[PDB]
Amino acid sequence: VATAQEETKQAPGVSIITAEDIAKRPPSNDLSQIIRTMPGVNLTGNSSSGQRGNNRQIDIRGMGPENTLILVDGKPVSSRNSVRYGWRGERDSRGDTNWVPADQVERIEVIRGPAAARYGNGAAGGVVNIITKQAGAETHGNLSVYSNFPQHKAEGASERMSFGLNGPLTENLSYRVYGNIAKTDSDDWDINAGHESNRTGKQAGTLPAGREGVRNKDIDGLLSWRLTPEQTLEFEAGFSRQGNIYTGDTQNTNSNNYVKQMLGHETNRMYRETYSVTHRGEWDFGSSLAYLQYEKTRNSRINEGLAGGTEGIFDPNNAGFYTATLRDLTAHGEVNLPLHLGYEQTLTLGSEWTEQKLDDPSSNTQNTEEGGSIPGLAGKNRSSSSSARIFSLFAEDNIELMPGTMLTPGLRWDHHDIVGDNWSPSLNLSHALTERVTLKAGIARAYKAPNLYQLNPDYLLYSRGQGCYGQSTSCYLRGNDGLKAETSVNKELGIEYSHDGLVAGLTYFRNDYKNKIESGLSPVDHASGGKGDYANAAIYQWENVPKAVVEGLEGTLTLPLADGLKWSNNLTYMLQSKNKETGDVLSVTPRYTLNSMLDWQATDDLSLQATVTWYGKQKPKKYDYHGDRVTGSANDQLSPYAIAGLGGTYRLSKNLSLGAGVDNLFDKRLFRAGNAQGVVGIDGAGAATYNEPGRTFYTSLTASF
Numbered sequence: 001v002a003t004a005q006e007e008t009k010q011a012p013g014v015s016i017i018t019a020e021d022i023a024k025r026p027p028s029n030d031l032s033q034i035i036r037t038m039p040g041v042n043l044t045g046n047s048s049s050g051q052r053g054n055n056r057q058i059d060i061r062g063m064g065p066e067n068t069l070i071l072v073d074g075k076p077v078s079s080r081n082s083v084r085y086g087w088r089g090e091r092d093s094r095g096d097t098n099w100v101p102a103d104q105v106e107r108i109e110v111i112r113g114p115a116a117a118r119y120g121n122g123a124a125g126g127v128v129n130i131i132t133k134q135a136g137a138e139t140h141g142n143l144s145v146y147s148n149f150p151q152h153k154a155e156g157a158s159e160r161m162s163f164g165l166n167g168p169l170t171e172n173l174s175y176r177v178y179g180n181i182a183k184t185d186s187d188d189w190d191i192n193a194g195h196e197s198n199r200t201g202k203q204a205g206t207l208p209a210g211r212e213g214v215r216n217k218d219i220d221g222l223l224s225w226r227l228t229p230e231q232t233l234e235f236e237a238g239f240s241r242q243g244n245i246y247t248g249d250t251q252n253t254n255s256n257n258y259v260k261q262m263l264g265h266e267t268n269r270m271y272r273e274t275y276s277v278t279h280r281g282e283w284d285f286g287s288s289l290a291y292l293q294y295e296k297t298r299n300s301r302i303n304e305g306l307a308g309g310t311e312g313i314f315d316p317n318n319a320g321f322y323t324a325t326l327r328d329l330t331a332h333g334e335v336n337l338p339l340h341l342g343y344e345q346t347l348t349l350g351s352e353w354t355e356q357k358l359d360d361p362s363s364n365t366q367n368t369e370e371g372g373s374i375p376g377l378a379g380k381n382r383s384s385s386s387s388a389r390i391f392s393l394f395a396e397d398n399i400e401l402m403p404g405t406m407l408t409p410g411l412r413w414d415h416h417d418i419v420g421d422n423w424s425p426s427l428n429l430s431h432a433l434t435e436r437v438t439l440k441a442g443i444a445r446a447y448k449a450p451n452l453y454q455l456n457p458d459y460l461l462y463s464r465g466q467g468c469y470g471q472s473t474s475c476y477l478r479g480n481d482g483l484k485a486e487t488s489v490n491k492e493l494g495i496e497y498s499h500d501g502l503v504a505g506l507t508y509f510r511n512d513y514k515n516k517i518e519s520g521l522s523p524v525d526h527a528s529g530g531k532g533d534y535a536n537a538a539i540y541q542w543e544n545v546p547k548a549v550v551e552g553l554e555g556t557l558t559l560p561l562a563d564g565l566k567w568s569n570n571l572t573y574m575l576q577s578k579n580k581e582t583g584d585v586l587s588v589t590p591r592y593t594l595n596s597m598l599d600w601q602a603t604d605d606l607s608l609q610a611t612v613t614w615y616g617k618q619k620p621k622k623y624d625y626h627g628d629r630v631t632g633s634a635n636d637q638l639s640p641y642a643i644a645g646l647g648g649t650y651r652l653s654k655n656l657s658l659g660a661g662v663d664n665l666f667d668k669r670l671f672r673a674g675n676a677q678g679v680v681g682i683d684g685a686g687a688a689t690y691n692e693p694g695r696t697f698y699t700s701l702t703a704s705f
């Protein structure tokens with residue numbers, strides 16, 4: 001009997017991307033590009049402001065990217081938690097899917113809804129687990145190189161070069177190492193000129209930036225030592241560095257002179273260092289796994305403001321870099337025990353402990369002189385430091401009820417040192433109706449701890465009125481340590497026909513989303529003192545939005561037209577996404593997304609690929625920061641559109657393949673006009689918040705032994 005962990009990787013809410021899929025749709029740089037084509041996955045911001053809108057990240061079933069937990073070889077990636085979380089729920093972050101280089105990935109696992117809740121904190125949407133190629137019984141290695149070439153030159157081209165080498169040292173000692181260097185160029189500063197929202201006053205000439213660029217350096221070493229036939233001990237260290245290439249991005253799309261000085265410059269750099277020890281054992285009466293991970297993330301970037309329009313724009317009064325540091329510590333143990341009597345079943349016991357320490361000398365520095373002081377909050381020299389610790393125990397049991405039929409109950413208990421106890425129960429069922437048809441169902445309660453910015457009372461944003469809910473008076477936004485965790489009851493009912501390479505399936509999912517954390521709507525208090533008409537500014541906190549809901553359909557259809565010819569489709573359809581308190585939308589996703597590949601292995605040494613992605617309509621948020629129906633261009637929608645691509649790979653030998661193709665064959669292009677709503681002298685842009693890149697040719701070479 002399979003463990004509950006391996007078994008639940010067979011739910012309809014589960015997708016696998018292989019190393020061979022990566023070869024046939026090679027990503028520019030970030031893996032999000034290919035990860036997003038799975039059913040139930042979008043590439044979206046975290047809320048609906050449209051801020052930092054070219055910085056979109058992986059979203060599972062509309063639940064936001066903060067609810068997508070990224071693992072590498074089963075170990076958490078937490079680095080984006082080192083970037084400032086803004087009034088509107090975005091971070092100036094490119095996300096956490098670009099730390100492992102695409103050509104060293106063996107496979108990617110995407111686990112959605114109820115089969116993912118067992119992973120705990122931050123899996124309310126789901127889990128994406130990036131697995132790296134590993135050593136075997138013989139020295140192996142590869143060299144992979146990529147390059148694209150956009151028709152339009154303003155758009156940023158990507159150059160990417162990686163190697164891997166792996167194999168034996170001793171009989172009982174293996175190594176696996178890789179190194180990657182990559183560069184996606186920034187879009188030209190001016191790429192959105194003519195598409196920018198209307199720009200009055202002093203904001204005349206300001207521009208929504210295109211896509212930011214990134215320089216990557218990744219180096220990983222792994223050493224695998226066989227103590228015994230029954231025990232293995234693995235040591236690994238990782239060093240990654242991303243530095244951007246800045247092209248005019250600012251939270252509000254306003255500008256100043258520091259912005260313009262910095263065009264082309266590196267204005268943020270993220271160093272990520274990972275060390276890990278892993279014990280793995282296969283035994284007489286089961287197996288077991290224990291690991292320790294230390295992740296240290298240094299986020300160095302230029303000081304930005306924290307008030308109204310100055311929020312998220314470089315500040316000339318505090319010019320220069322600062323460094324936020326994230327130390328994240330993760331320990332994990334589990335034993336797997338096959339039990340034979342009664343039913344065939346496999347029981348799994350485990351605990352987990354995590355600590356997140358965050359040092360950030362910049363985000364807590366807003367002073368209170370204009371809006372009046374806030375009892376209990378020092379105006380200067382507040383602490384940089386946050387932390388939270390979670391302890392967790394769990395038990396999952398995968399019970400063969402009769403052959404065909406599997407029932408897999410679990411319980412996880414989580415103790416957060418500030419927020420308290422959480423109980424996440426789960427039930428995952430698969431039953432076989434035929435050699436060909438399988439019914440599956442799942443219900444779990446997933447868990448999300450407040451992030452360290454939401455939770456901190458020293459974290460303080462300010463606006464003179466334009467961001468304030470329900471008024472034009474000055475207001476403050478303040479963290480809250482009395483917050484409850486977000487929980488979500490992720491239901492799924494799904495059915496699948498599968499036979500002779502022919503697959504046809506359709507899943508319904510509903511996630512009932514309790515206590516989503518968001519900026520509050522009522523002032524809890526008022527500050528006293530200050531200057532002029534801004535004196536005695538309102539005080540709001542980060543609050544738990546009591547109930548929200550997402551709902552949709554995942555579908556997939558795969559037919560073998562002939563021996564050498566396969567037609568595949570992944571389908572996402574978003575039925576509902578609602579803050580039930582404000583009736584506004586949680587996330588801006590396309591109404592549907594259909595991904596379609598035709599794969600012809602026309603020859604033994606030649607495969608050809610055609611792809612079509614159809615995106616549906618996209619609607620912006622209906623309400624502004626004040627909470628009032630928006631007006632003008634702020635209502636603009638994106639009409640449905642499709643991106644098509646052709647590509648191929650030619651086997652020159654066993655040891656060498658060429659690849660080449662075209663993304664966006666019909667040069668369908670979109671442009672970021674700004675943010676979804678209007679501010680003073682800056683007309684809204686509704687759903688037009690991102691740059692879709694135009695026709696782009698690409699080539700590739702892979703040599704391997």
Ligand SMILES: C#CCNC(=O)[C@H](CNC(=O)[C@H](CNC(=O)CNC(=O)c1cccc(O)c1O)NC(=O)c1cccc(O)c1O)NC(=O)c1cccc(O)c1O
Nearest residue numbers: 202203252254307308309310462463464465466467679680
């Ligand atoms: C040029 C120009 C546009 N200028 C303004 O809109 C001025 C003066 N402020 C500024 O120009 C910049 C830049 N302003 C902009 O680029 C346009 N505003 C925004 O994008 C904005 C977005 C969300 C919330 C806000 O409060 C915003 O001002 N903002 C600030 O210096 C500022 C500092 C502390 C507190 C604030 O609220 C500030 O606005 N502020 C106001 O008119 C204002 C009036 C009521 C409420 C506000 O929030 C205002 O900013």
Ligand SMILES: [Fe+3]
Nearest residue numbers: 308309464466
């Ligand atoms: Fe303002």
